[PDB]
Design a protein around this nucleic acid. Structure first.
Ligand SMILES: [Mg+2]
Ligand SMILES: [Mg+2]
Ligand SMILES: [Mg+2]
Ligand SMILES: [Mg+2]
Ligand SMILES: [Mg+2]
Ligand SMILES: [Mg+2]
Ligand SMILES: [Mg+2]
Ligand SMILES: [Mg+2]
Ligand SMILES: [Zn+2]
Lengths: 138, 48, 41, 98, 157, 180, 154
RNA sequence: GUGAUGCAUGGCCGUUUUUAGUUCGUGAAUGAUUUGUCUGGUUAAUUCCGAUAACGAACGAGAUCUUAACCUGCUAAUUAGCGGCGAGUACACUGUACUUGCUGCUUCUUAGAGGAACAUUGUGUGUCUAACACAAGGAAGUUUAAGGCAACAACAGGUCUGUGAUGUCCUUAGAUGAACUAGGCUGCACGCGUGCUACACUGAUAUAUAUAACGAGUAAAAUAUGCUUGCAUACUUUUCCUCCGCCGAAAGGCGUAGGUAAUCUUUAUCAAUAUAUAUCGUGAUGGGGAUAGAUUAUUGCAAUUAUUAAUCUUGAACGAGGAAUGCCUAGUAAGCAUGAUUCAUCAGAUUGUGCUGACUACGUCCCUGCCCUUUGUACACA
C-alpha cells in the first residue's frame, strides 16, 4: 500500500514515501525531471535504472527533503530511493525479488542501502577548522 | 554629571564593579574571570 | 603581445587560433554558422 | 502543565511520579513530551591575563523543558502536583479549556 | 514577564550571591546549607530579593587566624577527616608562611583521584584565603568521600 | 546494460599492462555513470585502488586553492574533455585516458640513488601530472581548460613529448638512469 | 536540449513540473507580446540591489523579475516584500573587506507587485500575511506552464 | 587608588604535557641513593606480556563524563510532523499540483531509557605470550570520531590593570581618590607579527536557478492638561528580534503585527560557494578596489583625526611572490558563507555552526623538538 523510509548524507534527510500507483516519482512538489543541476541527475536516477523502469509502474514515490546543501541532498534522495523500493518489496511483493534487487544494488555500490556516517567535526580553538591551527612566527 | 546610560562605563560587573570584559549575554553582567569562578554555582558545567 | 582583430571542425579556441580573432567574434561566427563552452561540426 | 528544570534525572523522576499519580483515575493524561533543550553556552576565555595560548572553555547550562497535558478540574490537578517536590524543578500549571 | 533562559541565569546568579553572603557572615560556622539570630539574615534576604570540605576549610582558616604551628594543625585536620570516614584527603597551604619567598606545602593521607568525572563527583573541594601577618595564606582542602561505586573496581563475589 | 556518462560504455576498453589493471579498478562494482562518488577511498591503505579512474582525474583537476572544493565544475570539465576526444581525434575517450595513464608513470625515481616505483604511485603521479600540465596550459592563455586538458590527454595517448607531463616523466627517467 | 529518456511519466499539470529558467523566459516573452506591464521611469537606470554595483544588462529584466516573482508566489502561501528581497539577494564584495550577503533593492519588487495586483494576478490577503497569488492568476500561470510543456514535447 | 612591587603572596591560567609519567609499603643492595619503575616484544599509553632482588599497592594512563555515529520499526506527541477527511482551484485517466476548516500513525521532528563491537567469526604474522595485519559480517573495526577531565613536581612564566583575594611602601583636598571639559591611545623615514583582498577565463560581470547548521532575541520615550523653548501634573504604548503594508535608487524611514519563544522574527529554509543561460576575451583588462573627491542616512549629548552605512565618481600596488617559515591524514586541507561574543553604532577578530569535499601518507628518525638506557662532566643560578 504505502511505505515510509529515509535516506541520510551529512545532514540532509530525504524521506521517501513509496505508495501503490502508476509510476511518477517526485520531490516535495516537483518531478525528478528537475532535481537541480543536469550533471548530478544520474545519481538520483541510478537505482531506478538498476532495478528497471517497468518494475516501478506499480509504485508511486514522493520524497520530502530537508536540510543540507545540494550534492548531499541528492545523495540522501538516492539513499531514500534505495531503502524505499527494497523496503516495499520486502513487505508487499515477494522475498526472492527483493533479494535479487539487493544483490543488484550491492553489485553497483554501497550508499544506496547503507548510510554515509560522516559528519562535520567540531572546530577547535586556536584555529579556524577542526585541525587547522593558526600560525607561529617565533 | 554626564550621560552614563549607554557605553562600557555605563554599567559594570555585578560582582566587582569592573567595567572591562563583562559577560553581557542573558543579562548575566559578570566580568568573565569572575564568571569562570562562579560557573559551578550558577549551573554552567563544562561538557564539551 | 597579440592584439587580435574584430573587423575582417568548429570550436571557439580553434577559431581564435586560426584567423587571429577575439573569442566574442568567434562565438558570433559560430552562431552565424548555426543559423557556456562550445562544440560544433 | 510545563515543567522547566536544570537537572535531567530529577525532572524525569518528577515526570514519572506525575504519570503514576495520573494513572490513579479520572485523568486523560497525554504522555510526557520533552522539549528542545535550548542550551545556554558561554565561551569564556580562561586565564584572567592575556598569557598562555588562549584556551577558551565552552560552558553549557542545558535547560530541560518538559510538557504534559490533562482534561480535569483545578483542585484535582493541584493535588496531583503535590508530590511534595523541592527547589530544583520549576512547575507551571495551565488550567485553560483552550 | 521574563524568559526561561533569562530566568535560569538570574536564579543561578541569586544562588551565587546568597552563597557569598553566607560566606561573608558565617566565619564562626560549619557552613554548607543553601536551602530556604537568623531573623536578621532572613530580613536581609528579603531586602535583597523582593565529611564536608568547605566546613573543614573554614576551620583551618580559623585555626590559622588564632595562630598555631600550621603543620600540627594540618595533621589534626587530616586525623579528623580520617575519623569522619574519608577514603582519602589532601590539603595544600601555599603563601608567605614563615619565610618571605614562596613555599607550598602538601598534606595528603588516603588516595585522591584527580582526573575524570569521578573526580568531579566523588571529591568535595574548597578554597579559602586566610589573611594573616604580612599577606595571605592560601588554603585548599580536597576530600574524597565514601562512594555510588567507583568505575575502577570490578568486585567479583 | 552498464555505462558511463550515458555514452562511453567501458565494456569496449582494453588495458594490456597487468600491473596497471591491478592498481586501477574499472570493474563490476567500480562501474559509475558520473564521477561524483562519496566513497571512503582514504580510510584504508589500498582502498584508493578500488576508486574509478574518472573520479581520480576529477579530484586531480579540482586542485589549486581558489578552485578547491568545486567538484561539479571539475566533473563538467572532464565531460567536456571526453566529448572533445570522442569528436576530434575520434576514439573511445576512456581508452585514450587508459593509454595516457599507462604512458604517464615514471617507472624509476631518484632518492637520497635510483629506485623503482609501485604501480599505484605511478598512476597517481600520471593523474597529477596530466592535470597540472593542463592547468599550466590554461593559466593566462585564453584557450580554455577543457580543450587544453583534452589536448594533453591526446598527447599522452600518443606518447609524444610536446605536452608537459610526458616531458616531466622523461626527465625523471633520465635522472633515475643517471643515478644508476 | 533538456529532453532525455527517463524511467517515469511526468504529470505536466502545474508549474512545479516545469523547468524554471525556460518557463520564466517564456512568461517574459508573453508579457512583452501583451504589453500588459510597463517599465516605470527609474527602471531603466536603477541597480537591482546594493551588491550588484552595476546595471542588469538584460533590457527586459523587469519582465523576467516579474515572472520570477509570480513563480515564487505560486511556490509559497503568503510572501512579503522583505522575503522577495531576501530571495533575490547576492554576494556584495566590499572590495577589501570580505563579502557579505546583500538584501535586494525592494522598491522595484514592490512596484512590480503593485502592478500585478492592478492587473489582477496577485492578492493581498487580509487573513494570514503579505500578498499571495490570486486564483485566476494562478490558473493562467498553470495554463502557461502546460503550453510550455506541450511546446517542449513538440 | 586601572598607584609602586607578580622577586612579598592568594586564587586562577598557562607551559614543561596531553607526554606518560610520579609515588609508597615491606624486602634487598656507611651514605646521598638504587631497585621495584627492566635486556627484549607489544601498546595511543611505567598499556600489557616475558625476563627478574623483588613482590604488592596507590595517583597518572585506561575506565568514567559529554556529544556525534546505527537500532529498538518498544517509551512519548506539543509549540513537530505524518496521514485521516471535508471544502475547493487547475489539469490528467476511466490520480497529480495548490490553499482554507476540522481532528488512527511516530518512519522523518524532538529526547529520555535501553541496545549495539568484544578485534566477534574467518586467515596470516608474533616467544604461535601480550598483541598486531588482512578478509567477511556489519551502522561502525586506527580505545568508532571528537572533545572534556587532568597526577607528581616545578618555572623566581603571567595576572595586585578582574576582584572589597592582599602585605608593605607611596599618595590623602594645589589627592596618584572620585567627577567634568576637551585631546590622545588610531600620531609615522622604518623593522617584525595575525589576518583580509588580489593578481583573472576552473574567472569577473549580470540575470535565473538550487539548496544549510548552530543560534540569538523586551532609569528612556509618546500624548494631553496647567503656567512661564522650560518646568509641573496626568496617562500609556514603545527600550531587543523584526514579520507585514506603505514611502525611499540606495541606505533607511514611517505605520502597525507576532514573539518573554519547537508557537512569532524564521527555519519544508536566514547564507555563499554551487549550477544554468547571457556579456566579456587575455589586453594592468569590464581582473583588482587601494587612495581620493564630493552627498544621503543611521547610531549617539557629541561623528572632524572622516563610527558605520549607502549613491556617484577616483582605477594605485599586484602577471603566483626572494631569504625563510606555518598548518594539515577523511567530512578533515582549502574554498564558501553564516550564527554568536564584544554591541548605543561598527568584523577584516575570536568563537561556534554548517555548505561545496582535494592531494598524499598509512611510514621513518634525516632535520626539529621531547622522552629513555648507556657514557662523560670541573655544570647544580645546571
Ligand atoms: Mg585514573
Ligand atoms: Mg610569577
Ligand atoms: Mg627508581
Ligand atoms: Mg583518561
Ligand atoms: Mg591599543
Ligand atoms: Mg578582537
Ligand atoms: Mg617547526
Ligand atoms: Mg657548583
Ligand atoms: Zn568582577
Amino acid at each position: 500500500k504505502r511505505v515510509q523510509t529515509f535516506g541520510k548524507k551529512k545532514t540532509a534527510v530525504a524521506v521517501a514515501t513509496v505508495t501503490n500507483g502508476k509510476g511518477l516519482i517526485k520531490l516535495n512538489g516537483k518531478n525528478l525531471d528537475l532535481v537541480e543541476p543536469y550533471i548530478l541527475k544520474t545519481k538520483v536516477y541510478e537505482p531506478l535504472w538498476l532495478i528497471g523502469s517497468g518494475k516501478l509502474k506499480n509504485l508511486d514515490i514522493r520524497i520530502r527533503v530537508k536540510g543540507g546543501g545540494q550534492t548531499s541532498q541528492i545523495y540522501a534522495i538516492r539513499q531514500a530511493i534505495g531503502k524505499g523500493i527494497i523496503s516495499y518489496y520486502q513487505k508487499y511483493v515477494d522475498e526472492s525479488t527483493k533479494k535479487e534487487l539487493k544483490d543488484v544494488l550491492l553489485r553497483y555500490d554501497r550508499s544506496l542501502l547503507v548510510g554515509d556516517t560522516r559528519r562535520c567535526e567540531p572546530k577547535k580553538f586556536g584555529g579556524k577548522g577542526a585541525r587547522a591551527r593558526y600560525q607561529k612566527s617565533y | 554629571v554626564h550621560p552614563k546610560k549607554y557605553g562600557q562605563g555605563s554599567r559594570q560587573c555585578r560582582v566587582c564593579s569592573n567595567k572591562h570584559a563583562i559577560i553581557r549575554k542573558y543579562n548575566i553582567n559578570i566580568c568573565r574571570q569572575c564568571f569562570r569562578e562562579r560557573a559551578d554555582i550558577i549551573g554552567f558545567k563544562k561538557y564539551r | 603581445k597579440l592584439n587580435h582583430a574584430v573587423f575582417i571542425v568548429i570550436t571557439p579556441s580553434a577559431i581564435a587560433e586560426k584567423y587571429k580573432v577575439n573569442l566574442s567574434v568567434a562565438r558570433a561566427v559560430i552562431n552565424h554558422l548555426a543559423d557556456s563552452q562550445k562544440l560544433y561540426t | 502543565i510545563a515543567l522547566t528544570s536544570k537537572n535531567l534525572r530529577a525532572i524525569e523522576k518528577v515526570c514519572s511520579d506525575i504519570m503514576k499519580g495520573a494513572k490513579e483515575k479520572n485523568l486523560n493524561v497525554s504522555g510526557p513530551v520533552r522539549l528542545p533543550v535550548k542550551t545556554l553556552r558561554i565561551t569564556t576565555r580562561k586565564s584572567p591575563c592575556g598569557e598562555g595560548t588562549n584556551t577558551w572553555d565552552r560552558f553549557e547550562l542545558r535547560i530541560y523543558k518538559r510538557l504534559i497535558d490533562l482534561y480535569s478540574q483545578c483542585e484535582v490537578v493541584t493535588q496531583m502536583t503535590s508530590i511534595n517536590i523541592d527547589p530544583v524543578v520549576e512547575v507551571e500549571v495551565i488550567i485553560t479549556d483552550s | 514577564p521574563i524568559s526561561k533562559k533569562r530566568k535560569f541565569i538570574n536564579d543561578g546568579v541569586f544562588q551565587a550571591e546568597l552563597n557569598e553572603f553566607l560566606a561573608r557572615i558565617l566565619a564562626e560556622d560549619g557552613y554548607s546549607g543553601v536551602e530556604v539570630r537568623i531573623r536578621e539574615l532572613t530580613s536581609l534576604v528579603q531586602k535583597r530579593f523582593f565529611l564536608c570540605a568547605m566546613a573543614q576549610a573554614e576551620s583551618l582558616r580559623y585555626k590559622l587566624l588564632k595562630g598555631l604551628a600550621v603543620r600540627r594543625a594540618c595533621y589534626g585536620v587530616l586525623r579528623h577527616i580520617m575519623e569522619s570516614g574519608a577514603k582519602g584527603c589532601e590539603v595544600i597551604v601555599s603563601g608567605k608562611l614563615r619565610a618571605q619567598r614562596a613555599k607550598s606545602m602538601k598534606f595528603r593521607d588516603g588516595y585522591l583521584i584527580s582526573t575524570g568525572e569521578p573526580s568531579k563527583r566523588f571529591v568535595n573541594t574548597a578554597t579559602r584565603s586566610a589573611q594573616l601577618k604580612q599577606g595571605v595564606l592560601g588554603i585548599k582542602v580536597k576530600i574524597m568521600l565514601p562512594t555510588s561505586i567507583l568505575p575502577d573496581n570490578i568486585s567479583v563475589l | 546494460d552498464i555505462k558511463l556518462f550515458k555514452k562511453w560504455s567501458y565494456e569496449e576498453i582494453n588495458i594490456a599492462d597487468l600491473s596497471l589493471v591491478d592498481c586501477i579498478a574499472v570493474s563490476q562494482k567500480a562501474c559509475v555513470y558520473t564521477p561524483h562518488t562519496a566513497g571512503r577511498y582514504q580510510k584504508k591503505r589500498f582502498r584508493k585502488a578500488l576508486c574509478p579512474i574518472v573520479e581520480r582525474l576529477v579530484n586531480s583537476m579540482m586542485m589549486h586553492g581558489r578552485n578547491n572544493g568545486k567538484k561539479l565544475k571539475a566533473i563538467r570539465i572532464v565531460a567536456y574533455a571526453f566529448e572533445i576526444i570522442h569528436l576530434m581525434t575520434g576514439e573511445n575517450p576512456l581508452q585514450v585516458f587508459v593509454n595516457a595513464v599507462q604512458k604517464g608513470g615514471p617507472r624509476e625515481d631518484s632518492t637520497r640513488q635510483a629506485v623503482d616505483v609501485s604501480p599505484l604511485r605511478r598512476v597517481n603521479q600520471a593523474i597529477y601530472l596530466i592535470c597540472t600540465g593542463a592547468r599550466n596550459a590554461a593559466f593566462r592563455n585564453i584557450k580554455s581548460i577543457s580543450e587544453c586538458l583534452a589536448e594533453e590527454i591526446i598527447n599522452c595517448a600518443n606518447e609524444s613529448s610536446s605536452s608537459y607531463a610526458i616531458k616531466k616523466k622523461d626527465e625523471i627517467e633520465r635522472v633515475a638512469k643517471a643515478n644508476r | 536540449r533538456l529532453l532525455e529518456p527517463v524511467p517515469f511519466v511526468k504529470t505536466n499539470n502545474c508549474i512545479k513540473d516545469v523547468d524554471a529558467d525556460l518557463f520564466i523566459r517564456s512568461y517574459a516573452t508573453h508579457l512583452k507580446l501583451h504589453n500588459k506591464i510597463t517599465y516605470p521611469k527609474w527602471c531603466t537606470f536603477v541597480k537591482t540591489g546594493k551588491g550588484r554595483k552595476l546595471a542588469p544588462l538584460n533590457e527586459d529584466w523587469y519582465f523576467i523579475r516579474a515572472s520570477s516573482i509570480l513563480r515564487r508566489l505560486y511556490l509559497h502561501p503568503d510572501i512579503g516584500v522583505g522575503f522577495l528581497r531576501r530571495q533575490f539577494s547576492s554576494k556584495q564584495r566590499r572590495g577589501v573587506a570580505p563579502n557579505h550577503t546583500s538584501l535586494a533593492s525592494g522598491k522595484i519588487l514592490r512596484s512590480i507587485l503593485q502592478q500585478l495586483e492592478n492587473l489582477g494576478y496577485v492578492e493581498q490577503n487580509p487573513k494570514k500575511k503579505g500578498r499571495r497569488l490570486t486564483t485566476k492568476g494562478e490558473n493562467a500561470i498553470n495554463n502557461f506552464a502546460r503550453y510550455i510543456n506541450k511546446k517542449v514535447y513538440n
